[PDB]
Structure 1
Amino acid sequence: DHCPLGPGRCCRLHTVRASLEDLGWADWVLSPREVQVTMCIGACPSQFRAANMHAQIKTSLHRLKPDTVPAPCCVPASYNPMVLIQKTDTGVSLQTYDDLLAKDCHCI
């Protein structure tokens, strides 16, 4: 919360519409036909949603040695599960996947 790069431009949840083809799942997934992928995107400037102590250090070191240490990664803090209906050789399977959709975002 509060982005020094202007609203929306910092690490936050986005929804990107993807078809089975996009994912490379059209051979094994039957339903759903497309997925609203929740995903963490945006910049990670100083003190923005720092995940932990490591993330603060990363911020300070990147500011100081941009050549050696990269900016912190915008990444999921937690995930939502998803139900996939998949194809088997003789029928169908119903499977829950745990770490598929991003729930929450932080920087590291």
Structure 2
Amino acid sequence: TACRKHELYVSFQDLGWQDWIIAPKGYAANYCDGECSFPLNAHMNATNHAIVQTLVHLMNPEYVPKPCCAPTKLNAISVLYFDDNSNVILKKYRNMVVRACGCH
């Protein structure tokens, strides 16, 4: 019931990316979950619009839904994968992991 950074380990064996990804076999996505209620403390990194929205939701519940707990700080991970021509390529996929979840 609060915007948090729940940690989890996602494996590429389960997603089906098993015969075209050499490494990593899995990484940590650290999804975000919770709810945002008026007012929001500095811990919940929120924008001004998020605050206006939660206030207009407190004034009228059916008018506007609560803000959404979304990632704010993301990093990148390196993936060494096969292409369609049996070659292998290293690429830095951006915005793959989460390090902070705010009421964006």
TM-score range, shorter chain: 0.7 to 0.9
User: Is 1:59 the equivalent of 2:76?
Assistant: no
Give the counterpart of 1:38 among 26, 30, 40: 30
The alignment partner of 1:69 has SS state of coil
Superposition RMSD in Å: 1.8
C-alpha contact 2:45 2:101 (8 A) present in aligned 1: no
Structure 1 residue 106: deviation in Å? Answer: 0.7
TM-score normalised by length of structure 1: 0.78
- 1:103 is aligned to 99
Q: Which moved more, 1:34-43 or 1:52-61?
A: 34-43
- 2:8 is aligned to 16
The alignment partner of 1:25 has SS state of coil
* Structure-2 separation of matches of 1:50 and 1:61: 19
- Cα-to-partner distance string for 1:27-83 (whole Å, 9 max, x where unaligned): 532211122112222222221415211011011011122212111110111101111
Q: Which moved more, 1:49-58 or 1:70-79?
A: 49-58
- Please identify which structure carries the higher strand content: 1
Equivalent position amino acid for 1:16 in 2? L
In the alignment, structure 2 segments of 5+ residues that lack a partner are: none
* Structure-2 separation of matches of 1:69 and 1:26: 42
Q: Which moved more, 1:19-28 or 1:35-44?
A: 19-28
TM-score normalised by length of structure 2: 0.81
